[PDB]
Design a protein around this nucleic acid. Structure first.
Length: 48
DNA sequence: CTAGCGACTAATTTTTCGGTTCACGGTCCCACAACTAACGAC
């Protein structure tokens, strides 16, 4: 699940808040599997 | 010291593509321009 692309955010425009883990990610977005770098938090993985 | 002896080259034609013409219902920071409320002078 990518937050980037047409109609989405940009790496330069991406603040810290969108990259963190929300309490609503529980069971929907994995709080572990994210890229380690400039794309952290902006690219997430679906939960099982 | 000398002589006898063992088929290629030039001229003319023809054809496809391009040119031309006609032309109605994100963030943070540093400057710059307004700009206005208050302050002072005639």
């Amino acid at each position: 699940l990518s937050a980037l692309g047409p109609g989405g955010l940009s790496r330069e425009r991406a603040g810290f808040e969108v990259r963190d883990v929300h309490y609503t990610h529980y069971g929907r977005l994995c709080p572990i599997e994210t890229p380690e770098g400039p794309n952290i938090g902006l690219i997430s993985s679906l939960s099982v």
